[PDB]
Amino acid sequence: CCNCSSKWCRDHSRCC
């Protein structure tokens, strides 16, 4: 789950 606008997913995403 790579999200740039979403902060929630961002926490579990390195891409963003």
From Swiss-Prot:
The modification Cysteine amide is found at residue 16. Disulfide bonds join 1-9, 1-15, 1-16, 2-9, 2-15, 4-15, 4-16. Changing residue 11 to A: Decrease in ability to inhibit both Nav1.4 and Nav1.2. Changing residue 8 to Q: 70-fold decrease in ability to block Nav1.4. Block of Nav1.2 is completely reversible. The record marks 7 as: Pharmacophore key residue, the side chain functions like a cork in the bottleneck, with the positively charged amine group preventing the penetration of sodium. It comes from the Eukaryota. The lineage of its organism: Eukaryota, Metazoa, Spiralia, Lophotrochozoa, Mollusca. Changing residue 8 to A: Decrease in ability to block both Nav1.2 and Nav1.4. Decrease in binding affinity for Nav1.2, Nav1.4, and Nav1.7. Changing residue 12 to A: Decrease in ability to inhibit both Nav1.4 and Nav1.2, and potently decreases the binding affinity for Nav1.2, Nav1.4, and Nav1.7. Changing residue 1 to A: Structure similar to wild-type toxin, even with this disulfide bond deletion. It comes from Conus kinoshitai. The record marks 3, 8 as: Pharmacophore key residue. Residues 10-12, 14-15 are annotated as: Pharmacophore key residues. This is Mu-conotoxin KIIIA.
